Amino acid sequence: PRIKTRRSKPAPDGFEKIKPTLTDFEIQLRDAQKDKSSKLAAKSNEQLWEIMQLHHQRSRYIYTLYYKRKAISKDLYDWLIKEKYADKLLIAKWRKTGYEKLCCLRCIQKNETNNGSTCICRVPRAQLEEEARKKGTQVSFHQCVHCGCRGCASTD
């Protein structure tokens, strides 16, 4: 996350209760930052998908404790927002309707795809199965590229 400095405030009360989960996410990021053997290209991109998964689960955990379960106060949530434990924008898209479950910020931007549309992971799995049935083949999509989410629309 962000380093602990003099200008950064100390944490509000309740943060030591949630330190083991954030510390587990921290040490898994410490393991996932190091380069592996990583010779292939299809398995080079998976070790970025693990880090996108860890960042997504950390922000999902903070979102779950603040908005869903209402255990963390506004002071501690704003401190976890200042110290970059979770993105403002991912939590903000999770506040929206239709983007409750979401992979990452990259897969809802129409600015980065070649077609001017969103990413294929925002299509529901049932819609992909409907087009697979209408074409006759199987669902020819398994793992999204920016992040490794199989399907991340709000239904599925």
């Binding site: 998964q53 997504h56 479950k101 490794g148 199989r150 991340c152 599925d156």
Partner: peptide
Amino acid sequence: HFTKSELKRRRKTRKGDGPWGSWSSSD
């Protein structure tokens, strides 16, 4: 087209939990 209860009893069928739950259906 699936009903909402069918979406509930199909989004449990993905093996992991979260967006990274696999739809691959090995077993």
